[PDB]
């Protein structure tokens, strides 16, 4: 159960030296999207409670309301591991926190995090609403 | 005939029915009737007792490379 | 509105795995009606001349201006044709402007110049105009009524003048549960960055139901429609375009899976040039035409989405008025366009259109509840009132390639909120 | 004389092979059709832009915006350059109706 995905993540991350988003880890193991975020949080909590000095880097996502000049906007950001709490304190209302990615050796910008999702989409084209939380009804291939 | 060819030439230059040198004659007659400016019921009654003749059912300068 | 409701629950996602995770359903779109039939052109014969359009514009717009000058200057009326004027006598004239500007290019950045004349023109003759009138706020093609007298040098002295105004507006039924509508414009696929790529990915991931907690997934499930408005492929130089339609087909596939989508042609898009732009041909989209949730429309788009009626363009009239006038605020230019009862008054003189001959279709025959624009450089929204009971919400849609901002319109409270997307860049706060 | 007794043989837009039926593409060059539609609509687009710049220039050289143009001035380049774009557009509009319509029109 737990050792299954724990060993799968430990060979995907530290051995093949890859970059694991939640959508890649849900197209590999055939899992729901929210359960995949929970899986990644489980792995990072276990290996950060075990050792505290791993070769492990995280990136999160923060979403929520804001007011700049009167108006109420809705700001959504993919954030690094240092700057989380300041971004959390700038916001007014908080609406979504989960985990986005983990790494071995630190990147410089948000470059390859689009390459990964794009390439795993490229071969998997007959399903994108397969693991989606919203299942509409009138959209079935007809024409 | 020869009196019906001046009534149409008089309908074609009256400015209160429109600026018409690109279209047919009966299309301009029905365009004015829709807006109902005042089309007269005689420039209709010669475009019905004829077939598709190009010297009744055409604007004055439907030659003329303008 | 939206982000208020998105926090209305409990948060589950910083937790170890569970037995179940919640799912939802897309809200039904149980009423829709396209009523943009005067812009869909089936016959398309050229070989006319542009004089049939001005004549029917004047003939249709004349009784509105007579009926407004009566109740705006008193029923002791002095409305008169331009030839029957006597020297130095008080009268009202209804005509068409023509602005005589040099620096406008002929066949062989603003273009307003410190000297340029206005000329009031009717079907038979013209007259010059001076007095108390704005020289640089007005553009060629507006039809208006005016008050004054013929002076001695043949010119005309103007005291005050009035425009046509808003058309009637029937009221809409109120709604039970709030449904939202998302508006995007100008993705710019073909060039324009890599932060735009992650921005487009995060936008489609939010609306399809892949991102965020049960708050975001409950709130994005209520978004009923998606409208993409023009300028889908921003082009760097024509003489590239073949590889971009593949990626646009993939994106429209990933959106046609969950939501209904409406796609409109823009300034650069593979269609014609004249103003009632016809829909895109389906032979450039192999993948996305599998589903019956994708729809392709034209330039001026009308619709009746859940009782609320929409009308919009991809921002070709507003920038054309911006070229040959002095107004800067795009929301103001949109409202001014509403005030003279014409979607695009500068056509045809500096913005090309088809040569119609039966009826000019850019005159408003009714008043829309929402009226949006296209590729404007910044967000803006406003509410305006009519003389009668007429209220209109005005939105300017931003451009996604620079700002990365879209708009949510509520269909029960009738308000508009911006949404912005920003991944982290090459940012290091220790330098 | 002989020019009236035409047959008007259709031709493939890709490789110029005369054939029976009205479809635009050839059976060997059928796949590459989205690129062949992409090509030539950027030509119709540039003919549309040339029609409008010319036929409204006569309205400003004439004086009036509400009445017909009558000027067959043989020393003006404007005359007979405004005559050929009508036929270019007439021809290029009919070549794209080889392809079907992009939607219905009677709804
Ligand atoms: S054809 Fe040439 S000379 Fe004649 S009105 Fe047109 S622009 Fe002027
Ligand atoms: Zn061929």
Curated annotation (Swiss-Prot), chain A:
Mod. after translation: Ubiquitinated, but not targeted to the proteasome. Sumoylated. Sumoylation with SUMO3 may be predominant. It is thought to decrease the affinity for PCNA and Pol-delta4 processivity. Can also be phosphorylated in vitro by CDK1-cyclin-A complex, as well as CDK2-cyclin-A and CDK2-cyclin-E complexes. PCNA interferes with CDK-cyclin phosphorylation.
Residue(s) carrying N-acetylalanine: 1
Subcellular location: Cytoplasm; Nucleus
Top-level taxon: Eukaryota
General function of this protein: Accessory component of both the DNA polymerase delta complex and the DNA polymerase zeta complex. As a component of the trimeric and tetrameric DNA polymerase delta complexes (Pol-delta3 and Pol-delta4, respectively), plays a role in high fidelity genome replication, including in lagging strand synthesis, and repair. Required for optimal Pol-delta activity. Stabilizes the Pol-delta complex and plays a major role in Pol-delta stimulation by PCNA. Pol-delta3 and Pol-delta4 are characterized by the absence or the presence of POLD4. They exhibit differences in catalytic activity.
Swiss-Prot/TrEMBL domain comment: The PIP-box mediates the interaction with PCNA.
Descriptive protein name: DNA polymerase delta subunit 3
Organism this protein belongs to: Homo sapiens
Gene designation: POLD3
Portion of the full-length sequence here: 2 to 144 of 466
UniProtKB/Swiss-Prot annotation, chain B:
Effect of residue 33 to R: No effect on ubiquitination. Loss of ubiquitination
Residues in coiled coil: none
Induction conditions: In response to DNA damage, genotoxic stress and replication stress, following UV irradiation, ionizing radiation, treatment with methyl methanesulfonate, hydroxyurea, or with aphidicolin, protein expression drops to undetectable levels, due to proteasomal degradation. This down-regulation is ATR-dependent.
Annotated compartments: Nucleus
Keywords, in A-Z order: DNA damage, DNA excision, DNA repair, DNA replication, Nucleus, Ubl conjugation
Main subcellular location of this protein, as a coarse class: nucleus
Protein modification: Ubiquitinated; undergoes 'Lys-48'-linked ubiquitination in response to UV irradiation, leading to proteasomal degradation. This modification is partly mediated by RNF8 and by the DCX(DTL) E3 ubiquitin ligase complex (also called CRL4(CDT2)). Efficient degradation requires the presence of PCNA and is required for the inhibition of fork progression after DNA damage.
Top-level taxon in the UniProt lineage: Eukaryota
The UniProt record lists the keyword Transit peptide: no
Gene Ontology terms describing biological process: DNA synthesis involved in DNA repair; DNA-templated DNA replication; positive regulation of endothelial cell proliferation
DNA repair as UniProt keyword: yes
Any one GO cellular component localisation term in the record: delta DNA polymerase complex
Family: Belongs to the DNA polymerase delta subunit 4 family.
The protein's name in its UniProt record: DNA polymerase delta subunit 4
Organism this protein belongs to: Homo sapiens (Human)
Residues included from the entire protein: 42 to 107 of 107
Swiss-Prot record, chain C:
Record InterPro entries: DNA_pol_a/d/e_bsu (IPR007185), DNA_pol_D_N (IPR040663), DNA_pol_delta/II_ssu (IPR024826), PolD2_C (IPR041863)
CDD domains the record matches: MPP_PolD2_C (cd07387)
Phenotype for residue 216 to W: Loss of POLD3-binding in a yeast two-hybrid assay
A single GO molecular function term of this UniProt record: DNA binding
Primary residence: nucleus
Keywords carried by this UniProt record: Acetylation, DNA damage, DNA excision, DNA repair, DNA replication, Nucleus, Phosphoprotein
Modification Phosphoserine occurs at: 15
Modified sites of kind N-acetylmethionine: 1
Listed result of changing residue 262 to N: Found in a patient with a syndromic combined immunodeficiency disorder; uncertain significance; affects protein stability; strongly reduced interaction with POLD1 and POLD3; in peripheral blood mononuclear cells, after anti-CD3 and anti-CD28 stimulation, drastically reduced protein expression levels, despite transcript levels similar to that of wild-type controls; patient's cells also show strongly decreased POLD1 and POLD3 protein levels; no effect on DNA prolymerase activity, when tested in transfected HEK293 cells
Cellular component terms per the entry's GO annotation: delta DNA polymerase complex; nucleoplasm; nucleus; zeta DNA polymerase complex
Keyword DNA repair set for record: yes
Record's signal peptide: none
A GO biological-process term: DNA strand elongation involved in DNA replication
Subcellular location: Nucleus
Keyword Zinc-finger: no
Similarity field: Belongs to the DNA polymerase delta/II small subunit family.
Name of the protein in question: DNA polymerase delta subunit 2
Organism: Homo sapiens
From Swiss-Prot, chain D:
Binding locations of [4Fe-4S] cluster: 58, 61, 71, 76
Span of the annotated motif CysB motif: 58-76
Tissues showing expression: Widely expressed, with high levels of expression in heart and lung.
Localization, UniProt: Nucleus
CysA-type ZnF: 12-29
Binding site for Zn(2+): 12, 15, 26, 29
Superkingdom of origin organism: Eukaryota
Impact upon substituting residue 60 to C: In IMD120; likely pathogenic; strongly reduced interaction with POLD2 and RFC1; leads to lower T cell proliferation following cell activation
Induction / repression: Up-regulated by serum stimulation.
Disease: Colorectal cancer 10: A complex disease characterized by malignant lesions arising from the inner wall of the large intestine (the colon) and the rectum. Genetic alterations are often associated with progression from premalignant lesion (adenoma) to invasive adenocarcinoma. Risk factors for cancer of the colon and rectum include colon polyps, long-standing ulcerative colitis, and genetic family history. Mandibular hypoplasia, deafness, progeroid features, and lipodystrophy syndrome: An autosomal dominant systemic disorder characterized by prominent loss of subcutaneous fat, metabolic abnormalities including insulin resistance and diabetes mellitus, sclerodermatous skin, and a facial appearance characterized by mandibular hypoplasia. Sensorineural deafness occurs late in the first or second decades of life.
Protein family per UniProt: Belongs to the DNA polymerase type-B family.
Protein name in the entry: DNA polymerase delta catalytic subunit
Span of the entire protein shown here: 1001 to 1107 of 1107
